[PDB]
Amino acid sequence: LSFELLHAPATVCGPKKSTNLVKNKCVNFNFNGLKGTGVLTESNKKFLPF
Amino acid sequence: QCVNLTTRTQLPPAYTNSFTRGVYYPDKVFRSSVLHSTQDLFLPFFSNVT
Ligand SMILES: *[C@@H]1O[C@H](CO)[C@@H](O)[C@H](O)[C@H]1NC(C)=O
Known part of the structure; x- marks a missing residue:
């Protein structure tokens, strides 16, 4: 598994409150x-939007 | 399926200048009112472009 960590917006999260x-x-x-x-x-x- | 071309005219490629072209964002991080140095592949200024 290759992780692109903190190089782009993240949408893969496990916990949430x-x-x-x-x-x-x-x-x-x-x-x-x-x-x-x-x-x-x-x-x-x-x-700016980006 | 392709069609061969035989009407091409022989002409050597021309060269023009690249005064202030060939710059992009080195990374997706956003910075403001700072001067930062990044080592990355880039088009050099004042060079031939075909
Ligand atoms: C581009 O290359 C030609 C020779 O191929 C040279 O005469 C010319 O000075 C070069 N131009 C630049 C901007 O380096």
Whole structure:
């Protein structure tokens, strides 16, 4: 088995739990296999679709 | 099934310049307001292209 790890968006995951969005709280998370701890706010920058 | 061609005119290939062509994203990761160096296969600038 050959794994393309963290080179593209991932859609093959095993576990999942129900969670809801929270703002302005520096809390731990796991975004697409990447872990961090920070608040969630908005920004004015523009994101290209790719 | 193919049809042979006998009306071809003999003409040696021409060469033009490649001033600012032959650049792409080295990886799928997105970076902003930084200057990064990546070693990868690329078309050199100011060279013949057929
Ligand atoms: C392209 O090759 C020809 C000879 O084949 C040469 O005279 C010319 O200078 C080359 N052009 C560039 C941009 O290297």
